[PDB]
Amino acid sequence: DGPEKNYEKTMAILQIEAEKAELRLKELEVRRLMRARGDGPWYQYPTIDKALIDHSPKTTPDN
Amino acid sequence: VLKAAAHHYGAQCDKPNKEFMLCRWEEKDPRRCLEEGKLVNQCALDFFRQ
Numbered sequence: 001d002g003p004e005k006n007y008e009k010t011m012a013i014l015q016i017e018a019e020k021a022e023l024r025l026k027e028l029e030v031r032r033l034m035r036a037r038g039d040g041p042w043y044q045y046p047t048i049d050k051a052l053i054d055h056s057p058k059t060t061p062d063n
Numbered sequence: 064v065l066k067a068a069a070h071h072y073g074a075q076c077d078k079p080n081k082e083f084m085l086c087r088w089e090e091k092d093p094r095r096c097l098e099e100g101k102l103v104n105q106c107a108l109d110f111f112r113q
Binding site: 062 | 084091092
């Protein structure tokens, strides 16, 4: 085939791979931030559900 | 003595007693319903005075 075909194919492959590398580094940074802050959807370790708490009148007035 | 007159005491002194219970069950602090406790004692004394 023509050389220009391989030229364009190389350009496309380079773009795809470079974008993949950018995304991988971005993912690593995002993961570190989320695991160090817990401010993202990832690494949300469970906590006690407030629904379990009962607010009905107890026996002793001072709870 | 209290138990003998317990039923009548509750009936006669219902309002002051219930108010104090509501206070302690909402304020949840003995230092905010002290005056209500006084009224309960005073009304209880009046009940026995009669």
